């Protein structure tokens, strides 16, 4: 019944199999179910977001984004509270894998990623972008506060979350939204409110699959 704060600890303890694991909030006894990727780039990855089929509704409240929703087996959002707790304890990298509808793949990697507390609206902090999914960060820098349909913290006179759909670190509104509307195979182009990552696929292109994952920077 041993506790692990993340998938790197799950891995280090000898659990090197991909699947769902029970994680423990730091300095707490509260638990959360995350999916662990033990293969990709050496393993130890905690998935904080996954899109793949459009089965889960991402137009959720501040509370649902703070706590988490969906299934760790399929589409889900881990939870802002847990990720902010985890990422403030030690330095994590953020890896983002993307799939278009034409059979291609690309990724973005950040040397440092963390979320501020709920008081600071879970504002994103990102450094050192590498990868094949753009040479400029699709998440706007410096990081914006997080915004939901019931929480306008963007830099837009509009409500980015209501216009683009889902919770995200919208700017005005910024070059990304992996939490936007899922569009199928022939309805994925010229969609302002889709699953967007501008510096890879450009304007209004809605992605087929997305995965956001974290691992301590000192792993390996």
């Amino acid at each position, epitope marked *: 019944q041993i506790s692990f704060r993340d998938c790197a600890e799950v891995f280090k303890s000898g659990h090197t199999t991909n699947g769902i694991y029970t994680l423990t909030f730091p300095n707490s006894t509260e638990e959360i179910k995350a999916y662990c990727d033990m293969e990709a780039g050496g393993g130890g990855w905690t998935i904080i977001q996954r899109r793949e089929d459009g089965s889960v509704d991402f137009q959720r409240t501040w509370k649902e984004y703070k706590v988490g929703f969906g299934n760790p087996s399929g589409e889900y959002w881990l939870g802002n509270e847990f990720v902010s707790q985890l990422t403030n304890q030690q330095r994590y990298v953020l890896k983002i894998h993307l799939k278009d509808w034409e059979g291609n793949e690309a990724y973005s990697l950040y040397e440092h990623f963390y979320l501020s507390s709920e008081e600071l609206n879970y504002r994103i902090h990102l450094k050192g972008l590498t990868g094949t999914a753009g040479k400029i960060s699709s998440i706007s820098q410096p990081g914006n506060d997080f915004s939901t349909k019931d929480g306008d913290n963007d830099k*837009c006179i509009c409500k980015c979350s209501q*216009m683009l759909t889902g919770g995200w670190w919208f700017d*005005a509104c910024g*070059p990304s939204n992996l939490n936007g509307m899922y569009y199928p195979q022939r309805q994925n182009t010229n969609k302002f409110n889709g699953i967007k990552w501008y510096y890879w696929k450009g*304007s*209004g292109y809605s992605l087929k699959a997305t995965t956001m994952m974290i691992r301590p920077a000192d792993f390996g």
Partner: antibody
Amino acid sequence: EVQLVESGGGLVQPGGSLRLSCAASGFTISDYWIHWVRQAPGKGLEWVAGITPAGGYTYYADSVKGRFTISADTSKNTAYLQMNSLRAEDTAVYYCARFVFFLPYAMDYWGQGTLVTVSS
Amino acid sequence: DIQMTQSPSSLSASVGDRVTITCRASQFLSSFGVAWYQQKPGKAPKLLIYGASSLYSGVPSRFSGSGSGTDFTLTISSLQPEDFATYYCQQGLLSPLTFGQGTKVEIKR
């Protein structure tokens, strides 16, 4: 038919004040944003101020901040531009416009414009 | 405070010519927030193109728009004599909502 009718223009002396009105018809101002735009003689179009009547959130161009107040009365279905400490370069045709905040997300209807002259 | 740099400041072209006006934003803009307006002398501005590339109702299809990010374009594919006017881009996303400096279109005859 959607219409915006501005009134309250005319001649004022520098340092003087003037209130412009924007009377909406064919729509409810709380379902939109109301923005004021102006055009000074021989100059380009200039965005002045904007109001979200559902909330009262206001936005201003730096050129008018501290001197102009944009407001709205949802009962009268009318928006206003209170212009104080007027300067010579405030002389312009002032237009109010309906800003649609859902798609098309732009100013689809405009008033006819009201001339404001700031001179002694 | 986003800057909208419009070019050219003025242009002169013949009836039937294809004309393109460019607008450069100082920061990334969501394409849905970019609009083009036409203003004839002594008339109120008229919406031409909304959301960077959508033609507004009542606007002739010789008017088109394109681009994303920081680079937006207004095209008049067959310049008509009535197209004499100043054209403006605007971003309605980040306050203050300052317009481009405008492009004065003159008809060469």
